[PDB]
Amino acid sequence: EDSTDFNDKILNEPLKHSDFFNVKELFSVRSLFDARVHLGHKAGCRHRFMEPYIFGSRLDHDIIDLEQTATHLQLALNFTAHMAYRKGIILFISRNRQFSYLIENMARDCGEYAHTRYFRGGMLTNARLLFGPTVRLPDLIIFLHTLNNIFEPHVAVRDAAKMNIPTVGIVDTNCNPCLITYPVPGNDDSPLAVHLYCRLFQTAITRAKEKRQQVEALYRLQGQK
Amino acid sequence: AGSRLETVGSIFSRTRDLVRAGVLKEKPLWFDVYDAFPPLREPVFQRPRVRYGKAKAPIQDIWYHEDRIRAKFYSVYGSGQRAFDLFNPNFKSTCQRFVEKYTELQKLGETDEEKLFVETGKALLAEGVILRRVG
Amino acid sequence: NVESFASMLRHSPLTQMGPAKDKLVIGRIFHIVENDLYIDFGGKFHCVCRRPEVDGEKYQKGTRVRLRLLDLELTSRFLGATTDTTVLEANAVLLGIQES
């Protein structure tokens, strides 16, 4: 009797709004341009599935269309906020060691999880053995870098799809976005780009968690009286 | 009961179908969010193929009209001994200052190319700019 | 009257620079490993330059320096490869320190 109203007022209400957490106010094409998100790899490194998201090549250096990035980034942040609102487990994954420390701290600050280390065979596809039969896997995996250190796709991208886990991923011009659920074309190398990504996801996740508590508290006070 | 066939459809299509068939008793936590706010492209595995014959990537080289002026300025006067400051978003180099004056004089009706380039150098020298010809 | 991406790209210093070969740029040292200086100069990738023999101690974290760029990204395609190999760093020559 009271559960249907709970799930309707708390879990189903956010899904009726186009931007329930107002993540569009977090970034702009200018803010992305200042972080050098449009800078891609050289044309010789281009992945063919990233061609839709490329504005052009400026002297053999690919330029990422930030108008598309802005639309993809809006969707990725929107999905991430909703999953944080629903109390999903969000796992950040990246093998770029220049940013391992930054990413691990961002996860701890937002109350989420980070995996920046060597990814051992079967963390996801054999989790019950490695962790235990009652282990809960992540509900969302966010890749700040989708390639490993030999310039191949991170194994967790394939394994996340196997386990039916949605993936958000920054995909540079040499990356493969086919299996990434919510790809965001953008520069994954420059510290200014990577720092921006961490602020946006950190803020989206923190905002969604605060929104969940506000709604719950209001729903209880009104329930008693 | 589920499906690890990551190359068969997408996590959404595989999940939606197994929910209908009753194989999955409950929907995953992410399913309702994906449904309301789906990605622009459904994430379906694809095998990247190599181009052959007369197939070429659609990416186009980015050029501007002023690039012709920049190529000539670098050839005639070389790169300025002044250093580029790519951190300042409003930085103007000697070449950019040359290009802006070159554009101003073109809008005043001058149409010759060799004449429109010599008058621009004089204007900057009058303004105190150092233009050392390479040769 | 919201600026478009095409406008940002057209008027960006990196776009206005043209080719990067033999271009003097100002870089900033952000990381140092022994005598290896990691210098950002506004591009996608940093460059790594060895500490100069003269006035080596003047090069510290945050020190702004003058560079002569050679390549924004060191990449090459090797025989039997479908793509290009990249070392994920720019090629530049450290000239000295920038002072006011």
Binding site: - | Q60, W63, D67 | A6, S7
Partner: peptide, 26 residues
């Protein structure tokens, strides 16, 4: 449409091809 969009043309910064020491000599 938009004035700042890229325009199609040939590389203005392209360098000439290399030449041997005897290129152009009998």
């Amino acid at each position: 449409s938009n004035e700042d969009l890229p325009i199609s043309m040939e590389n203005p910064y392209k360098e000439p091809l290399k030449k041997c020491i005897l290129c152009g000599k009998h």
